[PDB]
Write a protein that binds this ligand. Structure first.
Ligand SMILES: COc1cc2c(cc1OC)[C@@H](c1cccnc1)N(C(=O)c1ccc(O)cc1O)CC2
Ligand SMILES: CC(C)c1ccc(COc2ccc(CC(=O)NCCN)cc2Cl)cc1
Length: 340
């Protein structure tokens, strides 16, 4: 086979970050086909190149071998279409199916990689240097993965109208906050037979009246807000088991010139500063609902945002999602394979 030759050719190319604006502008299905059948190989190859740079003791583990096998099939699957003629509506139709199969195939990367982290901890240990390499690698791996799922969702959802695939051009942030809250409350009520209440305050700096809307991927925002709610609810409930009042969870949505910021404040009794970093560590949060904190932060970073935790041991925790207010500043943040 040629998979290694392909990986070498396509890893010569840099991934092309698109903006929210460019994503919404979707030109025709043929444009998406001819863009993607180049761009997906570039993005697959860049991350496969990086997997191959992992030391042999990591590389040879069944879990890494398995997801490398998925990535090779998916690259190969897309090659088939490189010669093919767009115009032919049966080339375009067959490509959509190929994306849908690829998306399926990769659904279990996260628990599959988690198993590799787990057997590394037992086989080689949980020293801080191992922690930094796991963290370095998986942040890039997962961000690459988020970026590929985004391209594929956008193609399959549009070529099968207010929403534009996964993108809401008029996303009401408070509505996504209530959705994530209600789902977290549902689970929290089930498991704990008590749930904190929600208060939302909005701060539209420029337009103190207007409800805060934005161009975003509401699924991504829901993933992050859901994780933050799980954390704030488990914390607030368990900190107050011997108590009768449950302090609410307070979310502020602030819109500035540049930042749309979403703070979730709880009185869960908080975390010592020393233990905050571990909450973002893939290795330290591997023990044996929601994507985890490390991955929630990647969704924030994906469009030039961030997710930060600040706690007050003895009181509780603030979690802030920072998004770009403006769709022009909302550009894919892609890990690129270079000398570094
Ligand atoms: C199981 O009960 C507790 C679960 C959690 C906390 C406290 C719980 O008991 C009282 C608490 C924590 C995390 C790590 C170490 N010590 C405390 N957590 C946080 O402060 C926290 C972290 C992130 C976030 O978005 C919101 C939060 O309130 C979370 C986990
Ligand atoms: C299963 C996945 C998530 C996984 C599990 C475990 C790891 C751990 O990866 C390590 C651990 C130690 C070192 C030090 C070293 O010797 N450096 C030389 C290598 N440049 C490098 C790497 Cl890439 C990564 C990814």
């Amino acid at each position: 086979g040629s998979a290694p030759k392909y990986i070498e050719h396509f890893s010569k190319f840099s991934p092309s970050p698109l903006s929210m604006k460019q994503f919404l502008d979707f030109a025709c299905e043929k444009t998406s086909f001819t863009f993607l059948r180049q761009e997906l190989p570039v993005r697959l190859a860049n991350i496969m190149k990086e997997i191959n740079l992992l030391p042999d003791r990591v590389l040879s583990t069944p879990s890494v071998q398995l997801v490398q096998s998925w990535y090779v099939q998916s690259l190969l699957d897309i090659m088939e279409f490189l010669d093919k003629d767009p115009e032919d509506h049966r080339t375009l139709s067959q490509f959509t199916d190929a994306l849908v199969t690829i998306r399926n195939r990769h659904n279990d990367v996260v628990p599959t990689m988690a198993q590799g982290v787990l057997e590394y901890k037992d086989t080689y240990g949980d020293d801080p240097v191992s922690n930094q390499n796991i963290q370095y690698f998986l942040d890039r791996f997962y961000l690459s993965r988020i970026s590929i799922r985004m391209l594929i969702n956008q193609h399959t959802l549009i070529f099968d109208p207010k929403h534009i695939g996964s993108i809401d051009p008029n996303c009401n942030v408070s509505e996504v906050v209530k959705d994530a809250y209600d789902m977290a409350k549902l689970l929290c009520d089930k498991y704990y037979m008590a749930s904190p209440d929600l208060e939302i305050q909005e701060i539209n700096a420029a337009n103190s009246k207007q409800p805060i809307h934005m161009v975003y991927v509401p699924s991504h925002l829901y993933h992050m807000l859901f994780e933050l709610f799980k954390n704030a609810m488990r914390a607030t409930v368990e900190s107050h088991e011997s108590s009768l009042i449950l302090p609410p969870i307070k979310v502020m949505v602030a819109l500035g010139e540049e930042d749309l910021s979403i703070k979730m404040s709880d009185r869960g009794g908080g975390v010592p500063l020393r233990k905050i970093e571990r909450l973002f560590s893939y290795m330290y949060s591997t023990a044996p609902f929601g994507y985890g904190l490390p991955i929630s932060r990647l969704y924030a970073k994906y469009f030039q945002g961030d997710l930060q935790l600040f706690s007050m041991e003895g009181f509780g925790t603030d979690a802030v999602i920072y998004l770009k207010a403006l769709s022009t500043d909302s550009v894919e943040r892609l890990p690129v394979y270079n000398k570094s």
